Amino acid sequence: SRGEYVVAKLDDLVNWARRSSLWPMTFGLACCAVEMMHMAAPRYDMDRFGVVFRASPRQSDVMIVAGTLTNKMAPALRKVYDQMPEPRYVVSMGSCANGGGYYHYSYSVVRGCDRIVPVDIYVPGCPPTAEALLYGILQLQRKIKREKRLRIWYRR
């Protein structure tokens, strides 16, 4: 049908715009953030992929959890996640954010950020290299390229 073709093209256009421009909120916790700083460094230059740090959660598309989430910090992480306008995506960076990591058996550590927020991409490492984080970012872009919102609305 022509409607199917139209919604497919519009979804592709919409998906492309979102994947092309991804703004990750300027937010780091621990060790891994330093590696994130190296992804914005001249060698890798995430800005050339359309990726721009933005301080305000209201103007942010991605939240990169780069570091250990503690029990004292978890409410703040949840709050800043809830204030991101949709669509929003979460990338878990490093062992500490993935599953607690080297502080897994600690009284003051949340064992993985996925108990607090839903996670799209899990980047392993301690810390993941700037190439590892960049690979995870491109993987998230490929995942966004794959999603279909207008097709589901049309079929439903």
Partner 1 sequence: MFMINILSLIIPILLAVAFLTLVERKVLGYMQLRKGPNVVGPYGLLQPIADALKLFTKEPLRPATSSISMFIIAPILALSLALTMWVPLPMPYPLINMNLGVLFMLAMSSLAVYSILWSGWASNSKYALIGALRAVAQTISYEVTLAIILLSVLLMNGSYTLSTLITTQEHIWMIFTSWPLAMMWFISTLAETNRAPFDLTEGESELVSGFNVEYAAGPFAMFFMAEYANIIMMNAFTAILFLGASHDPHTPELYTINFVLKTLALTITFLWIRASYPRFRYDQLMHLLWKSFLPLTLALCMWHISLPIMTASIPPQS
Partner 2 sequence: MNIMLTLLTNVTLASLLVLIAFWLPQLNAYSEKTSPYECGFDPMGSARLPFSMKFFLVAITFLLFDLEIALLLPLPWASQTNNLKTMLTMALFLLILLAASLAYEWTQKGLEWAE
Ligand X SMILES: COC1=C(OC)C(=O)C(C/C=C(/C)CC/C=C(/C)CC/C=C(/C)CC/C=C(\C)CC/C=C(\C)CC/C=C(\C)CC/C=C(/C)CC/C=C(/C)CC/C=C(/C)CCC=C(C)C)=C(C)C1=O
Task: For helices 2-20 and 130-146, give the axis angle rounded to 10 degrees.
Answer: 160
Contact present, 75 and 39 (Cβ < 8 Å): no
DSSP code string of 82-138: HTSPSS-EEEEEHHHHHH-GGGTT-TTB-S-GGGTS--SEEE-SSSPPHHHHHHHHH
> Does 82 participate in binding partner 2 (rule CB under 8 A)?
yes
Q: How many CB atoms lie within 10 A of CB 4?
A: 12
Residue 96 contacts which entry, partner 2, ligand PEE, ligand SF4, none (Cβ below 5-8 A, type-dependent): ligand SF4
> Does 52 participate in binding ligand X (rule CB under 6 A)?
yes
What would the x/- binding string for ligand SF4 be over residues 93 to 112, using CB under 6 A? Answer: -xxx----xx----------
- Rg, Å, the chain Cα set: 17
- Of the candidate spans 44-52, 68-76, 102-110, 115-123, the one that interacts with partner 1 by CB under 8 A turns out to be 44-52
Residue among 8, 14, 116, 138 that touches ligand PEE (CB under 6 A): 14
> Does 86 participate in binding partner 2 (rule CB under 8 A)?
yes
Shortest Å distance, C-beta 59 to partner 1: 6
> Does 79 participate in binding ligand PEE (rule CB under 6 A)?
no
What would the x/- binding string for ligand X be over residues 5 to 44, using CB under 6 A? Answer: ----------------------------------------
Residues of the chain by 3-state class (helix, strand, coil), percent to 5:
50, 15, 35
Contacting positions for ligand PEE (CB under 6 A): 10, 14, 149-150, 152-153
The annotation places the binding site at 31-32, 96, 126, 156
